[PDB]
């Protein structure tokens, strides 16, 4: 039951940047490796591994999973997989911005804490084996409340001043 | 070293950056920039210092080489700013062209095989160092539409892109 149907792929070239020809391409690639036309988060994880000799990739992964998987049923459809890419490769700066925030803010309360935010740095350096996270969210952080909104997190994403003494 | 009008009229044009951000920005990179000037030594210790663990002097100092547009071994305040404003507000086909650029190492218009592995390289030794170059191999090989050997800022667009001819360099 893995084959791609009209309907599915006039839903596609709507909401996303693909054509007709590319999505029925990209889907062909996606069943070859993929052939229950679902993809496992371990399967993610060992697409990343392919990636870094050096560490477990697998936290971050495991976040980058949880975004693609729009109905967290524990698994990416095609039909996630091809919003996903298409947001990640073609999206505009604002889209991007969103997805970031997204990813970043775990729990989903439209909130990126500190935590929220050591988690994805941490998640980084063990995919690969401080004061300056601190700067960074203070200056995007602009009521001080220890707490960045999406309008805090696109602006100081798009170099509003205020980020100057987060440089060096 | 006051800033010109005419410097903020021609940065208004080729920036996102607004006159009153543009002065603001400008501020901030005297205090830090007492000269008006950074430096390439200057550029590298910033790098070290989110980078404890690597030697991330090969990749700041390519980095270093598309800030300075000019060539003359410092980045001024407009190369800074023009920098910043692709990096943080550009559209899509802007940034790709800046990465673009920061391989394609001797500005010919091209990114050779050489040119992509440096740069893999640069990264790696950054971070603590089959093969590395086998992955970057597949993806330049799908990446060559045309099977060159090299590759046009057209093809490396449509490539990072998701054209589907990255399929293979993916499976
Ligand atoms: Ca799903
Ligand atoms: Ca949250
Ligand atoms: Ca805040
Ligand atoms: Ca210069
Ligand atoms: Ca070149
Ligand atoms: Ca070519
Ligand atoms: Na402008």
């Not at 693609?68 to 073609?90: H, K, P, Q």
């Not at 999206?91 to 050591?118: C, P, Q, S």
């Not at 601190?134 to 009521?143: A, E, P, R, S």
Request: hydrophobic share 35%.
């Amino acid at each position: 039951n893995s084959k791609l149907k009209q309907d599915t792929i006039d839903r596609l070239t709507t909401d996303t940047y693909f054509t007709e020809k590319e999505i029925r391409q990209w889907h062909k690639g996606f069943l070859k490796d993929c052939p229950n036309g679902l993809l496992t988060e371990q399967g993610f994880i060992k697409i990343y591994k392919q990636f870094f000799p050096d560490g477990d990739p697998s936290k971050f992964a495991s976040l980058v999973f949880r975004v693609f998987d729009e109905n967290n049923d524990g698994a990416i459809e095609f039909e996630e997989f091809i919003r996903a890419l298409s947001i990640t490769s073609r999206g505009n700066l604002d889209e991007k911005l969103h997805w970031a925030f997204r990813l970043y803010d775990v729990d989903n309360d439209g909130y990126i804490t500190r935590e929220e935010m050591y988690n994805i740095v941490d998640a980084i350096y063990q995919m690969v084996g401080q004061k300056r996270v601190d700067k960074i969210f203070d200056q995007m952080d602009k009521n001080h409340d220890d707490r960045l909104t999406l309008e805090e997190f696109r602006e100081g994403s798009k170099a509003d001043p205020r980020m100057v003494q987060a440089l060096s």
